[PDB]
Amino acid sequence: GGVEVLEVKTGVDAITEVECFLNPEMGDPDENLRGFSLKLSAENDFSSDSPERKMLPCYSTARIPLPNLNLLMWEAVTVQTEVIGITSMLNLHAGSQKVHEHGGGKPIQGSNFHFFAVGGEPLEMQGVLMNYRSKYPDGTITPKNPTAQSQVMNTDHKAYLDKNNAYPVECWVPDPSRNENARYFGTFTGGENVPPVLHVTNTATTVLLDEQGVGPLCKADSLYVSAADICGLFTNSSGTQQWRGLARYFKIRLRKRSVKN
Amino acid sequence: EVLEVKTGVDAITEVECFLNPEMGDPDENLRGFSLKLSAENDFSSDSPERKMLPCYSTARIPLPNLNNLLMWEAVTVQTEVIGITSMLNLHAGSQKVHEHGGGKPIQGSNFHFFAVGGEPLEMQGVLMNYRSKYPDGTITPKNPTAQSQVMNTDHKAYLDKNNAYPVECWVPDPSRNENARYFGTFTGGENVPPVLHVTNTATTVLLDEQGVGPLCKADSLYVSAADICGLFTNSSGTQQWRGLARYFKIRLRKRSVKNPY
Amino acid sequence: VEVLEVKTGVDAITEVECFLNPEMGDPDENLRGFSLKLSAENDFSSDSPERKMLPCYSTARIPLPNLNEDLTCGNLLMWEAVTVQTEVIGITSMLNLHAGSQKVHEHGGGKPIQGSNFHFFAVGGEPLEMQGVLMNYRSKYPDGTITPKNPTAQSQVMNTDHKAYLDKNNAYPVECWVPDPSRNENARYFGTFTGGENVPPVLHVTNTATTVLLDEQGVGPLCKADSLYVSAADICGLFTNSSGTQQWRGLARYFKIRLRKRSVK
Amino acid sequence: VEVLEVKTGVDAITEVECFLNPEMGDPDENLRGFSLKLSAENDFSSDSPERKMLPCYSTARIPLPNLNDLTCGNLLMWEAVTVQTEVIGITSMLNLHAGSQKVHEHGGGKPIQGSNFHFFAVGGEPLEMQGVLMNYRSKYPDGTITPKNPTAQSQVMNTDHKAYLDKNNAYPVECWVPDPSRNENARYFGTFTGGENVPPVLHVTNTATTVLLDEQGVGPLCKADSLYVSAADICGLFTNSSGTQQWRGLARYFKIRLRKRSVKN
Amino acid sequence: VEVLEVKTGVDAITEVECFLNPEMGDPDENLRGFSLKLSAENDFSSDSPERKMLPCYSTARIPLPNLNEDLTCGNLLMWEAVTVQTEVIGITSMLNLHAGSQKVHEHGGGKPIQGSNFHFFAVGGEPLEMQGVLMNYRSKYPDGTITPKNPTAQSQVMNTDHKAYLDKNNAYPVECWVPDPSRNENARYFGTFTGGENVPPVLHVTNTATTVLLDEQGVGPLCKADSLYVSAADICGLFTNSSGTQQWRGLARYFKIRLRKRSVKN
Ligand SMILES: [Ca+2]
Ligand SMILES: [Ca+2]
Ligand SMILES: [Ca+2]
Ligand SMILES: [Ca+2]
Ligand SMILES: [Ca+2]
Ligand SMILES: [Ca+2]
Ligand SMILES: [Ca+2]
Ligand SMILES: [Ca+2]
Ligand SMILES: [Ca+2]
Ligand SMILES: [Ca+2]
Ligand SMILES: [Ca+2]
Ligand SMILES: [Ca+2]
Ligand SMILES: [Ca+2]
Ligand code: NA
Ligand code: NA
């Protein structure tokens, strides 16, 4: 969302600044519950595990188009990123189960995953499943023809994050054996009672240069941003639980680089 | 366009202030607390009272008139949350932890935030529930939609008024604030312990990557804060936010600039 | 004070070593280091805590080797505090789970001390400057304590009337006062508050750790009238008796402070 | 091995990439990456865990481009300089719909949580291990390699229990640790976090590198042109809807950068 | 000391390696590394813990190459400890949840070791200097222990009468004594106490970590009488038996210390 691209060229020197956000793809079970999943089911036998599409958070991604240009290529040098709306979880009056008789609502808590990537091509993913026998729904892209080895490392499960709201977060991780032309960062914190801990500051910049001083190079003059920001579980007054996600901001600086094809 | 730092005898000034917390102040005696929290309101019928909603605090601090032109440049800040030991009173009002025990400490979700800028803090609105009906005397996202639960770029505001912008509705906007520095941490959960450090030896440098601090437009500095420490649980089981004031000491220097006009 | 140069070498350096005992309330002669059992659920309009229930800040004034014996030589010296090594004394005493504490379950050991804690020290050349802040401005504080006077609802946030020196040991309740960040130009203070029923005490000891007390201009606290001021509060958590009653437990703090002679105008 | 100069030539650098699958017990063909359900409350005199209940260390020998023989010219060995490593599949624990006990009526499944151990090593020879037992009287199964001649002293430090991690899916994690008295030619890193309610906390990034050079600037030297990687990544316990519990493990990726080093022998 | 290796190379350097066993109480011959089960709720006026219930500090004197035939010199050569590498041994043993421990719930695995823990080591040129502090000054400590003498209520805070040397292994209860920050001029010590009934043990191992033992003047512990002292306490937490009874569990600690010869003022 909100993609803005600015190229400034003075002679030899060309800079592009990209600003955008990615909305989260938590499942959106109805139009009013944008940012949430469908309520979670539980205790499905591994042999009869058929999760509904709207229950499954997916990775977010966007292809950002750059000024269409040894080759000259756009090189991503820095990123500033932030999770947007962390204070929204201070609403304990709407929908959440009371913590006790006469108390306020229960904060969002529980397992969470915060992840982003910036690359010159789609993020390369490796599939790993909790249960290889899970039957995934139409509209998801999940590991093809999985086996019990898919519960550990099965090198058959290679994919590109090339479609928004399609690759379930539970099925896929960034592939550390690939991604030579992207930088990715994620933290998984698991557990029923895990507190969300989120920091915001406009003073943080991540440098995307590798050990040789080279950033992601934008093949075919396109930049890819990717995210997943599952903040935890929202517990309804009935006890049902729904994932809650938040959008992620990106500001990326790129420069024009002459490079070996 | 920034030129050189002025290096006279009177080229430095120090500003000190504190910001009181704006938790809701539900009666004349409960300054620093919110109204007791409601719970389990349907998203379609969520009408929080004003005194239940903590707000961001801010102050415009007028600076010596200087005047192509000189502007005050904020270089460092020392800041501290004031009165953290008041939470060691476990005899007053709080529910016993168990039969024969002391009162329950303040605990639960918290948010600690401050900013220093040369202009008002720029905010982005994000809601837990876009259908919340916010009370008279609050400034909340205007004409929100389900997209306001994720990122809706319509929701831009300046923190220009005290006791107005609820913390649950607004975050510092990472797409703006070019002339401010902000820092916040949200920690969510029923059982989160407050962890607060005080020392007069800690300094935050406000200079950006180019060595430039916030520049005080119109010879005014803006400080902003929110310090929701957690929930106070009354002996009845009702819960109220507790906030604390924030101290600021800002060092500024005179900076020559080309009038940007 | 206009600060000039550090004085040279040999006897230009002194070390002060001391400890501060904790002031937790000491409800009987056998329970030194503990508070009285905590009360709970007092209405804000009828909150009258007993003295022995209220931990207080510890403080001492340490007299330093006399400088400026030669009053009219026109070269004025003050001791400058440069470094401190400090730690909490007796942290392993909390491994006694056989005495007094409630069993964790049938046949189990005693419950460890845990819960809200506050660890704080300061080193200054004058008394520590405090700001009063109350949970409940209507609290009626007992004889023997020094607490914010004539408080109002504003005293629950920031009321600038409540300024005091930490000028008496075992008198200023920790729950009423904090170091004032708007003052203390001639002291350094450090504190961490961790609140909650189930917080674990986490305490580190090492004789290899040093805190430098010099400010941004390289100047440490300057000891007015050849006096060094140490202050502490080390509330370790709550001790839960077999009945379920709870008492604060505190421990002493050690200080080793290195000072040098500083010329001043 | 006496090290001489780093070689700087054209083919002086190589990269090895691999992953190690976890060895959690694999109690049936469908439950790769899990252990058998845990037994509990076995007397120390009658503790005989089944093989499928015991997570084991993973290890592999990685062959390197052949160098070299003192009679066949100059001596060269690969030196491991850096490693990039991470745990693969951490997001799979976001499946709370399959198998796991509901957290409460109408709730989602219980996340994997509880005791965990994350460990890796890179060496020029097999990892050297020291045996330590919870209970020296534990009878370990066919197919495992456990401390030989265990005694009560094996519950603390029995220097008899020395082994090389030279076999995958054989050395139970609960019986063995890396030996800090050996491993002169390897680097190892591990963290154990124990408890019923411990949250898994796992970071991934392709920007993180661990330098394997020692204080003299020397990395693991790959004897016989082989590198050894070792891992254990027990992520926590999976709680079935019945209340039974199973360990869950995940694979570990390694990318190791090596350079050619001249050596005397 | 379970095992000791002392190597003095051609280059006037000594490397000392040892493993120091924990002293948790050892209530029977099969429960090495554990304490006796804990008692609870003893009145402060009737608190008489049994010896086997009380973990004690571990210590050993390590003999070094005897340097000075001519002890009657104004300058002496002494061993100077420069670095230490240390590790807690056997942390993965706590992954045994099948033996002895109470089930977490019906059909579950055993309860992990958890609760209060203390991890401590020291390297010195002489015995570790200790300060006594008691939870309860009226505790009656058993035969075979060395505990603060003639304690008073001040012994529950700081009573400077309680000075001791850690001069006996398996004798000084951890609950009674701490390293004395007012002494130990010729030793370095490091400890972390984490208290609480549900605390998770968190233990890291790596052979890449080294602690430098030099003071601010670049001088390490100087080994008086050609002896080095290592000291430890590694209480990992409580083991909960299926009955509900609890026992401390401890682990051994490895030391690798590098020393050099220093000419010093007699
Ligand atoms: Ca599909
Ligand atoms: Ca690769
Ligand atoms: Ca591209
Ligand atoms: Ca601060
Ligand atoms: Ca302004
Ligand atoms: Ca009396
Ligand atoms: Ca008495
Ligand atoms: Ca030959
Ligand atoms: Ca060795
Ligand atoms: Ca050895
Ligand atoms: Ca080899
Ligand atoms: Ca001393
Ligand atoms: Ca000695
Ligand atoms: Na008192
Ligand atoms: Na196996």
UniProtKB/Swiss-Prot annotation, chain A:
Forms an icosahedral capsid with a T=7 symmetry and a 50 nm diameter. The capsid is composed of 72 pentamers linked to each other by disulfide bonds and associated with VP2 or VP3 proteins. Interacts with gangliosides GT1b and GD1b containing terminal alpha(2-8)-linked sialic acids on the cell surface to provide virion attachment to target cell. This attachment induces virion internalization predominantly through caveolin-mediated endocytosis and traffics to the endoplasmic reticulum. Belongs to the polyomaviruses coat protein VP1 family. A DNA-binding domain overlapping a bipartite nuclear localization signal is present in the N-terminal region of the protein and is required for efficient virus formation. GO terms for molecular function: structural molecule activity. It comes from the Viruses. Changing residue 121 to D: In strain: MM. It is found in: Virion; Host nucleus. It comes from BK polyomavirus. Keywords: Capsid protein, Caveolin-mediated endocytosis of virus by host, Disulfide bond, Host nucleus, Host-virus interaction, Late protein, Phosphoprotein, T=7 icosahedral capsid protein, Viral attachment to host cell, Viral penetration into host cytoplasm, Virion, Virus endocytosis by host, Virus entry into host cell. One of its GO terms (cellular component) is host cell nucleus. Homomultimer; disulfide-linked. The virus capsid is composed of 72 icosahedral units, each one composed of five disulfide-linked copies of VP1. Interacts with minor capsid proteins VP2 and VP3. GO terms for biological process: caveolin-mediated endocytosis of virus by host cell; virion attachment to host cell. This is Major capsid protein VP1.
